[PDB]
Write a protein that binds this ligand. Sequence first.
Ligand SMILES: Nc1nc2c(ncn2[C@H]2C[C@H](O)[C@@H](COP(=O)(O)OP(=O)(O)O)O2)c(=O)[nH]1
Ligand SMILES: Nc1nc2c(ncn2[C@H]2C[C@H](O)[C@@H](COP(=O)(O)OP(=O)(O)O)O2)c(=O)[nH]1
Ligand SMILES: Nc1nc2c(ncn2[C@H]2C[C@H](O)[C@@H](COP(=O)(O)OP(=O)(O)O)O2)c(=O)[nH]1
Ligand SMILES: Nc1nc2c(ncn2[C@H]2C[C@H](O)[C@@H](COP(=O)(O)OP(=O)(O)O)O2)c(=O)[nH]1
Ligand SMILES: Nc1nc2c(ncn2[C@H]2C[C@H](O)[C@@H](COP(=O)(O)OP(=O)(O)O)O2)c(=O)[nH]1
Ligand SMILES: Nc1nc2c(ncn2[C@H]2C[C@H](O)[C@@H](COP(=O)(O)OP(=O)(O)O)O2)c(=O)[nH]1
Ligand SMILES: [Mg+2]
Ligand SMILES: [Mg+2]
Ligand SMILES: [Mg+2]
Ligand SMILES: [Mg+2]
Ligand SMILES: [Mg+2]
Ligand SMILES: [Mg+2]
Lengths: 133, 134, 134, 134, 133, 133
Amino acid sequence: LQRTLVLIKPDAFERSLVAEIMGRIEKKNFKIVSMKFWSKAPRNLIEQHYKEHSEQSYFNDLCDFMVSGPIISIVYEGTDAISKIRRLQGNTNPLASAPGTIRGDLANDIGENLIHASDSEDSAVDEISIWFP
Amino acid sequence: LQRTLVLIKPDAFERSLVAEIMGRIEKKNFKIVSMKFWSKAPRNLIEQHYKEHSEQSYFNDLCDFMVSGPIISIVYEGTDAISKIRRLQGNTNPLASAPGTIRGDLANDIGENLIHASDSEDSAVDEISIWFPE
Amino acid sequence: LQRTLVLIKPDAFERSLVAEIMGRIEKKNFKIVSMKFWSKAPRNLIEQHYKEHSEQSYFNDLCDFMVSGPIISIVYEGTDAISKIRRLQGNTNPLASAPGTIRGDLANDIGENLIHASDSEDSAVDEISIWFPE
Amino acid sequence: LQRTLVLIKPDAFERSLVAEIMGRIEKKNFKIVSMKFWSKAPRNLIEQHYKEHSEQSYFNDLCDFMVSGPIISIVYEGTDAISKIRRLQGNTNPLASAPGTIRGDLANDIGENLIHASDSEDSAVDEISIWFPE
Amino acid sequence: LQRTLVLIKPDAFERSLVAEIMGRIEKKNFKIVSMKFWSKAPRNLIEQHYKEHSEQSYFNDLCDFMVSGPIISIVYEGTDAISKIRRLQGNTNPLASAPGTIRGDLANDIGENLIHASDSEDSAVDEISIWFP
Amino acid sequence: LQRTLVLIKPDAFERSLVAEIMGRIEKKNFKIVSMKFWSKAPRNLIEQHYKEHSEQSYFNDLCDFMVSGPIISIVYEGTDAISKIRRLQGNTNPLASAPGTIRGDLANDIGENLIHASDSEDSAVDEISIWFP
Ligand SMILES: Nc1nc2c(ncn2[C@H]2C[C@H](O)[C@@H](COP(=O)(O)OP(=O)(O)O)O2)c(=O)[nH]1
Ligand SMILES: Nc1nc2c(ncn2[C@H]2C[C@H](O)[C@@H](COP(=O)(O)OP(=O)(O)O)O2)c(=O)[nH]1
Ligand SMILES: Nc1nc2c(ncn2[C@H]2C[C@H](O)[C@@H](COP(=O)(O)OP(=O)(O)O)O2)c(=O)[nH]1
Ligand SMILES: Nc1nc2c(ncn2[C@H]2C[C@H](O)[C@@H](COP(=O)(O)OP(=O)(O)O)O2)c(=O)[nH]1
Ligand SMILES: Nc1nc2c(ncn2[C@H]2C[C@H](O)[C@@H](COP(=O)(O)OP(=O)(O)O)O2)c(=O)[nH]1
Ligand SMILES: Nc1nc2c(ncn2[C@H]2C[C@H](O)[C@@H](COP(=O)(O)OP(=O)(O)O)O2)c(=O)[nH]1
Ligand SMILES: [Mg+2]
Ligand SMILES: [Mg+2]
Ligand SMILES: [Mg+2]
Ligand SMILES: [Mg+2]
Ligand SMILES: [Mg+2]
Ligand SMILES: [Mg+2]
């Protein structure tokens, strides 16, 4: 049993895909244990969330996008939730994400990619602490 | 432009219908203004929400059901959102709710009926204040 | 609590709509009590099922259609299942069946109308005995 | 057997609902006879299509909206296709369109209402001649 | 042209996924040629069905689960039905089943995995004989 | 940004899958820039479209199938549309097409395979010129 942190990104709101994305996770039998709606996430939480990318060329654009609309932060619980939801999510690169995955079916950009999911036990604990202190 | 209060009820969680219900409202182009997840809503909140039903025979059973699992409280915004979301919701009674509505397609019980939606401007203001006192 | 008899008709098989129809009933929380698949139902069974239509002009065409492909006979159980599944089914006439109903969304003919559902407690008992004599 | 003229309106493209709408008609077993994609329909065509509305206050806004993005014009064929597709379409007014209909499920505005469908045999002939003069 | 034996497992009934599963197979153009509903399958048919697993640690739990609710046994027919429906089914292990497969999208447990499908020509003939003697 | 040529094949019309197929592409955020409905495509356009296959054993059957019902020709536009829509399409061979792809989920024959999509920049330009001269 694990908990993982998911963000529904602003593009999902723009494209009316919030329920589509949450529903794929729900259908896999993962349970919501915490959830918050952000009309606009604070810049600082975004920058901490993506702190590992702070020196990357895309950092400012990434942060700007992430505050360009609402987000939902969700903690999901289930056996091996971290790796399983990562598999549902699909590759960051739209040249690679597989049909059947969230990004494979729905995302068409490396940045506007609909969903964040924690990538490891340690990052899940960190991200949960950021969004649900 | 109106705001209405929606509750996703514990049966929606039990039956894995949360996204199905939220998706129906989303597809109609209503926007989420506020949203809160409750692992278990306090009974007092439920009693306030349903204060008008306090003398009904089902009142205690209703409150028990509403604290039996999680709830999501959502404020939706849109033109005439109150009446429109009520029409999407469907009638309380499973003998009446129309196919095409949330309850008509998905609910089979008068109590376990998946979704609350404010029924008037007055009650919306009241219910939003209960679930989102801030 | 009631039991009703449903037939998935040969047009549902031809149009690959079997799961679509069954899924609508499943999503409403009705439970399967008995189910039988018929590669081709015996004409006598069809004539008994529709005995009340024996003097109608369409009777032979109706029987021909019903043996033209497979049928699934299902007994569903639930509170007020008979009237509820009738409302999900929709009116026989394509000029009347409502969007949101099975026939309203999917059927375009008065005869090739995808689904049978018992219309009363009396007929349910009768039809269940025809399809599930055991 | 009838033919009716359907327009998929620019809001359907903006909201990525083209296939959703076309799919509802397809699932009802109507057949496409002719179809044209317009990156932007000429304003004159729109004015002719809606000539009966020329004195209405919304006429210019309606024409502006109709040229604001792509349109697909489709001729559908089927028994009583005109009235049937009108029932699937749903009422113009978001306070009235029924859950289960295209507009009832998906449209939230009196103007941005996703779909046109001919309302009579006379208007179908007229509209088909506008969009498919050949 | 082949026939294969599918079981819709009790978890599909519990989670109201019977039509979802049958529909994926139907949409692939496979045809039902036989079908039976079991309110509760006889223990002995289950034990014969899974006879190869009789000495495995999970055997008793597997059999208990399989009689814990209804099942549907279905014979499907189509060109290369056996391998094709196996591909639709997805890996037994939820760490491996691919998004887009039945188990990949819907199952979250190695045991409660929604669907059985014959794995070979010989096992299909055997399983069909068990469920449709 | 690229344009690619898609054909919705006659089997999609027969099986009422036109919107299902177009919808998968629409949900991936590709935009229609040209589209024509053919009640019956001219034999010569089909033979030119598939000119590379003219000496293959299946050529006549392929062409006969392609004129056996309506088709829709569509030009889709988007970043890397050619490879992305090819990935959505899935392998020609039903023993290989992956669940989650159009063919993987819906097609059950090597010939009756629902959809054509250009396989390269050069073939896209050629096919667009055939269907939209
Ligand atoms: N424009 C651009 N954005 C990028 C690139 N790599 C990552 N990003 C953005 C989008 C990602 O969702 C986010 C975090 O990157 P990540 O942890 O490697 O990706 P992921 O866990 O969201 O799949 O940063 C990139 O190469 N280009
Ligand atoms: N068991 C039972 N419960 C009832 C009955 N009427 C109402 N309830 C419960 C379920 C309703 O969702 C809740 C509030 O009643 P309401 O305001 O008349 O209905 P609604 O706005 O949820 O459609 O009380 C009733 O007659 N029997
Ligand atoms: N061609 C034709 N067939 C008809 C007509 N009325 C009924 N039928 C056929 C189709 C019906 O499913 C079947 C039984 O008629 P019913 O009991 O009045 O309708 P229903 O309970 O299936 O809605 O007989 C009719 O008017 N014309
Ligand atoms: N803003 C506005 N637009 C309107 C109103 N009534 C009609 N329209 C626009 C939207 C309609 O799709 C179009 C044609 O009107 P119609 O023939 O009465 O409606 P309909 O056949 O599209 O349902 O004109 C109206 O009252 N207000
Ligand atoms: N708990 C548990 N159950 C298992 C394990 N391996 C197999 N099973 C159960 C679930 C399988 O559906 C069933 C038959 O095993 P199988 O033939 O290797 O799997 P499959 O053909 O259902 O994918 O036995 C296992 O390793 N642990
Ligand atoms: N019967 C048969 N038909 C074939 C075979 N290979 C190709 N075809 C037909 C179906 C294909 O959609 C069409 C073009 O072949 P292709 O370019 O290798 O396939 P694809 O780009 O449609 O996946 O020719 C084949 O091996 N057998
Ligand atoms: Mg990451
Ligand atoms: Mg109320
Ligand atoms: Mg009747
Ligand atoms: Mg009109
Ligand atoms: Mg096996
Ligand atoms: Mg090719």
